[PDB]
């Protein structure tokens, strides 16, 4: 299936996904069981090897990973491609005997779709775990942002900026690659626009902090405003970050996790 919910996963399974459409499209007209195809004992031996490596890696991915969802969603994707691969092999034999078998073409098709489908699930499941890595980072920035309300000195400000800076950088780099892989404009825009705002406001949030931490130091000066202006940027940025979490959340949540 067109389970290409990513621009990379798409560019990977698209080419072969097309060829499969033909086989089904042609096998429907009766033009598939037509030709007497050569020996697929060599090529089918390749995919059988290719699938073994894919499965192997996926098995390791689960081994290492800390993501419990990916830990329990990957294994099946393995089984899928694994037995869909056997149908592929079977068809190769059926054809090695009779290059005209229409049921061999049935397996030849059902198997190709199983390989392409399983591969999709595999990648998609893995990717969704990567999206949760982003969500985590964002949820981290969200937390520290509130810490900006307890900063009462220049030394605190120095520390705060030193900390926010890095995470602010990581989530910025993560959202960058992220928006590129998206397959829907609307999402990409929000993701991009929202992250930009966060970038725009960061220096503003630091100003509001310096002004406050200073005006408060400059004792005997209007401070109910500096506070309000600092708490606003904190709120604005926090809101933008939630739109990001929400978007990333909408574009990856596979409901087997309830």
């Amino acid at each position: 299936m067109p389970v290409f919910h990513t621009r990379t996963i798409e560019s990977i399974l698209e080419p072969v996904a097309q060829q499969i459409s033909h086989l089904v499209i042609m096998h429907e007209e009766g033009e598939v069981d037509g030709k007497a195809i050569p020996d697929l004992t060599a090529p089918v031996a390749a995919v059988q090897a290719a699938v073994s490596n894919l499965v192997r890696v996926g098995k390791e991915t689960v081994q290492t990973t800390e993501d419990q969802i990916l830990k329990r969603d990957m294994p099946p994707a393995f089984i899928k491609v694994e037995n869909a691969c056997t149908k592929l092999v079977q068809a190769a034999q059926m054809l090695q005997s009779d290059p005209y078998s229409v049921p061999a073409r049935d397996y030849l098709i059902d198997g190709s779709r199983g390989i392409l489908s399983g591969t999709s699930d595999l990648l998609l499941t893995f990717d969704e775990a990567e999206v949760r890595k982003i969500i985590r980072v964002c949820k981290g920035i969200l937390e520290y942002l509130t810490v900006a309300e307890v900063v009462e000195t220049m030394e605190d400000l120095v520390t705060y900026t030193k900390n926010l800076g890095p995470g602010m950088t990581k989530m910025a780099k993560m959202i960058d690659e992220r928006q590129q892989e998206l397959t829907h404009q609307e999402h990409r825009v929000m993701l991009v626009n929202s992250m930009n705002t966060v970038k725009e406001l960061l220096p503003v949030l630091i100003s509001a902090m310096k002004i406050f931490v200073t005006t408060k130091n400059s004792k005997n000066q209007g401070i109910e405003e500096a506070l309000k202006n600092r708490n606003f940027t904190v709120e604005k940025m926090s809101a933008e970050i939630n739109e990001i979490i929400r978007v990333l959340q909408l574009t990856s949540w596979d409901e087997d996790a309830w």
Partner: peptide, 19 residues
């Protein structure tokens, strides 16, 4: 204090990275 100077300098280095 270089505090205000450092706070800025630190924010600068960060913004350049965010860039």
């Amino acid at each position: 204090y270089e505090k205000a100077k450092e706070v800025s300098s630190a924010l600068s280095k960060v913004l350049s990275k965010i860039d």
